[PDB]
């Protein structure tokens, strides 16, 4: 009986592919290939944040564009005052294996997670003087890859046990479970309305979900390898995608298909982090070959090279005002350019 | 141009980084090892004098001049390519092989072939522990080892079978900067901490010689 259902699914996916093909008239070529080039972009080393004694695996910027959170394998979560190259807090972690970190938009909470399958939240503004654990969220059967804050009470985490979950910090329960993504969900990005988010996984799929619902609405496809990074456009209608096949793309929510792809012939290392500028014109992509090169989100052009990392870059971040970019590698030193 | 609050914030930062340096000095003298193997391959009883501290299991004990830490990495059913780079700076990888299970022997061989040629494990040495040798030698009369490993000749003795298994395990090694340490041990063998200590100090000496341009 499953043969008829499989045939119906094959007919539906053939119709979907035909619809994407027929909607792909006046395509990515010669629609954005009519404007001026971005030019030459060179960023000098303004800051070199030091203080970790292990590999930095994550980094998130504050919404004041003043404070950073870097969580590393040494069991330490240092909160950095970037304007003066300064340390504000140092939170000893119970489990040193960490693959993600978050910063609440209010500036009050930071999140952390890793191979302990626990998203542990921390409270910075306390009337005791030190950062304490506020709640330990457990219930996944796999490691957590990326956590992003919606407000002071709701967290959404992407984990490697083929699921994503939205929690509430007060009671520590999974309000919404986002089933799908047969591979391991490896990244997550929030649109600038706290309503819809994207999530890539190892099974080469970039689904789009809704927070107020519990199901997908657009399943982008087209990568031939693993995914590692994802990032929305400032409009809220597009997103980028970094992957293990040295291929960073731009996708389109309205068209339900794939816009221009910025890949290079000589590059073979995987992409670990992608990020967008304030206007969305400049895309910064991390690279596993000890480098982090910039591109253009409209045309294919290597506008510049940001070099200086002794090890692999695993976290890249652009502030809300877009004033500075943070680049963190496994050399225990993370850099801020201009 | 610095204010009073700025000065006291700089002092707080100095205290934070001094405590960070103290913690890094304290934690550098701990040997980190990565236990591996098949299901029920003797990982839970590698050392009978260990204290235990889910995603992964961490167990620690102290022997002579060094403090040991073991990562069982059990229950991590996810893809074994996304969190291996977390365990890239381990000094040694303890692989446990159970000679008793003939069905799961090829699973252990496949795992050994996977981990001994990974990009993150090109330099990390491996301390083999051919566990469960007593009942293996007890059952070596009925089973001649050719039911699971063909293309060999021998007297179906314990020594030759152990040598053949060890040779098959070392045949999956393709690296000029790594040495596999093999040590047959019993389930009643209390002498396991000294084997790991000798192997680990030999590994550290070998790594120091490698880094200086020597062997």
């Amino acid at each position: 009986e499953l043969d008829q259902l499989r045939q119906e699914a094959e007919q539906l996916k053939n119709q979907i592919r035909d619809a994407r093909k027929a909607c792909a008239d006046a395509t990515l070529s010669q629609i954005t290939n009519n404007i001026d080039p971005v030019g030459r972009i060179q960023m000098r080393t303004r800051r070199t944040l030091r203080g970790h004694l292990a590999k930095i695996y994550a980094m998130h910027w504050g919404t004041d564009s003043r404070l950073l959170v870097s969580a590393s394998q040494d069991g330490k979560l240092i909160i950095w005052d970037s304007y003066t190259t300064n340390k504000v807090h140092a939170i000893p972690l119970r489990s040193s294996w960490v693959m993600t970190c978050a910063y609440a938009p209010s500036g009050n909470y930071v999140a952390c997670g890793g191979l302990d399958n626990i998203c542990s939240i921390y409270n910075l503004k306390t009337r005791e003087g030190n950062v304490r654990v506020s709640r330990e969220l457990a219930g996944h059967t796999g490691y957590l890859s990326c956590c992003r804050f919606l407000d002071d009470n709701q967290i959404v985490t992407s984990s490697g046990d083929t699921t994503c979950a939205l929690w509430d910090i007060e009671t520590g329960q999974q309000t919404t479970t986002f089933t799908g993504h047969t591979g391991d969900v490896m990244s997550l990005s929030l649109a600038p309305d706290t309503r819809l988010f994207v999530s890539g996984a190892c099974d080469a799929s970039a689904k789009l979900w809704d927070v107020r619902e519990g199901m997908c609405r657009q399943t982008f496809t087209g990568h031939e390898s693993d995914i590692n990074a994802i990032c929305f456009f400032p409009n809220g209608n597009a997103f980028a995608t970094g992957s293990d096949d040295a291929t960073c793309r731009l996708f389109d929510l309205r068209a339900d298909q794939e816009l221009m792809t910025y890949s290079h012939d000589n590059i073979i290392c995987g992409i670990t982090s992608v990020s967008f500028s304030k206007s969305g014109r400049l895309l910064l992509a991390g690279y596993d070959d000890f480098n982090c090169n910039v591109w253009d989100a409209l045309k294919a052009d290597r506008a510049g090279v940001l070099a200086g990392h002794d090890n692999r870059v695993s976290c890249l971040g652009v502030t809300d005002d877009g004033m500075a970019v943070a680049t963190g590698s496994w050399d225990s030193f993370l850099k801020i350019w201009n | 141009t610095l204010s009073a609050e700025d000065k006291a914030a700089v002092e707080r930062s100095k205290m934070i980084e001094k405590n960070l340096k103290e913690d890094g000095i304290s934690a550098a003298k701990d040997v980190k090892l990565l236990l591996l193997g098949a299901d029920n391959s003797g990982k839970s009883t590698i050392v009978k004098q260990m204290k235990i501290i889910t995603g992964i299991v961490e167990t620690h004990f102290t022997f002579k001049n060094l403090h040991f830490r073991l990562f069982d990495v059990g229950g991590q059913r996810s893809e074994r390519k996304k969190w291996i780079h977390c365990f890239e700076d381990v000094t040694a990888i303890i692989f446990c092989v159970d000679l008793s299970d003939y069905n799961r022997m090829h699973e252990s061989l496949m795992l050994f072939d996977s981990i001994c040629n990974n990009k993150f494990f090109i330099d990390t040495s491996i301390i083999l522990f051919l566990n469960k040798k007593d009942l293996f030698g007890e059952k070596i009369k009925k089973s001649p080892l050719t039911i699971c490993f063909p293309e060999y000749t021998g007297p179906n003795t314990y020594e030759d079978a152990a040598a053949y298994i060890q040779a098959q395990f070392e045949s999956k090694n393709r690296s000029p900067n790594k040495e596999i340490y093999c040590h047959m041990t019993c389930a009643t063998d209390t002498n396991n901490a000294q084997v790991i200590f000798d192997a680990v100090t030999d590994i550290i000496i070998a790594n120091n010689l490698r880094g200086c341009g020597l062997y």
Epitope: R66, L67, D81, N86, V88, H89, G107, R127, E128, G129, N130 | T1, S3, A4, E5, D6, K7, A8, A9, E11, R12, M15
Partner: single-chain antibody, 230 residues
Framework: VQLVESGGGLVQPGGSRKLSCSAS????????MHWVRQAPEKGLEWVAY????????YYADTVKGRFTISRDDPKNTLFLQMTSLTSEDTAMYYC??????????????WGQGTTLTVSDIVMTQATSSVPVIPGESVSISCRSS???????????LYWFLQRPGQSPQLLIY???NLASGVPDRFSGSGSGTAFTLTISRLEAEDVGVYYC?????????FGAGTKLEL
């Protein structure tokens, strides 16, 4: 979180006393604790200071060479050892906690004082007997000998409310930042050497004396005090 200060009492004009205060509820080593005295019918005055981990110890002009401050971090106790007690030291001695990082709120908790009996920047604020009506717009002013703005973009001026029979409580820090637990009616604004606390819709539990503080140059300067009547 509660600070209890013990000791004090009568002393001969030339003797010595060693006041001590203890904390129970917050991490002591992360806070730079202060000593602030209050004459029985006058304003507040800064006395002593010790940093986190005893890394910096500052004294006042009337405190240098005569007093000393120490803290016992393992036992969570702050010590004030005073020598050559004159008759001008007859004051109630307050223990004040303070933390310093980006976004901190220094001088956010005060301990109940110790009555002692022995038998720069200049700031002068407003009037001292203003007729507060319950429910109004009251603009308590302040002044300074300098424009208290640094290159960091932070203007430093603190507002304290002393209820009758109670220790001072922080209301506004930096220049316009509400402290935690302060209701939204309290609001402050100003510029260099011109500061005003605009209290709108005055209510109960607001009568008392209002104080300023500078925190650019470290020897602390208060104001005389503006008192809300009725």
């Amino acid at each position: 979180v509660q600070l209890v200060e013990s000791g004090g009492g009568l002393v001969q004009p030339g003797g010595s006393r060693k006041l001590s205060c203890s904390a129970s509820g917050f991490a002591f080593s992360s806070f730079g604790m202060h000593w602030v005295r209050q004459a029985p019918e006058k304003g507040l005055e800064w006395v002593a200071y010790i940093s986190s981990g005893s890394g910096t110890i500052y004294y006042a002009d009337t405190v240098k060479g005569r007093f000393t401050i120490s803290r016992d971090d393992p036992k969570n106790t702050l010590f004030l050892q005073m020598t050559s007690l004159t008759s001008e030291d007859t004051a109630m001695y307050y223990c004040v906690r303070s933390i310093y990082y980006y976004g901190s709120s220094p001088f956010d908790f005060w301990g109940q004082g110790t009555t002692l009996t022995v038998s720069d920047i200049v700031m002068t604020q407003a009037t001292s007997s203003v007729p507060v009506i319950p429910g109004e717009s009251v603009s308590i002013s302040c002044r300074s000998s300098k424009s208290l703005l640094h290159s960091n973009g932070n203007t430093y001026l603190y507002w304290f409310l002393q209820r009758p029979g109670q220790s001072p409580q922080l209301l506004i820090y930096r220049m316009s930042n509400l402290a935690s637990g302060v209701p939204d009616r309290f609001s402050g604004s100003g510029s260099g050497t011109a500061f005003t606390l605009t209290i709108s819709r005055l209510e109960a539990e607001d009568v008392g004396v209002y104080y300023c503080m500078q925190h650019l140059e470290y020897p602390l300067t208060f104001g005389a005090g503006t008192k809300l009547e009725l």
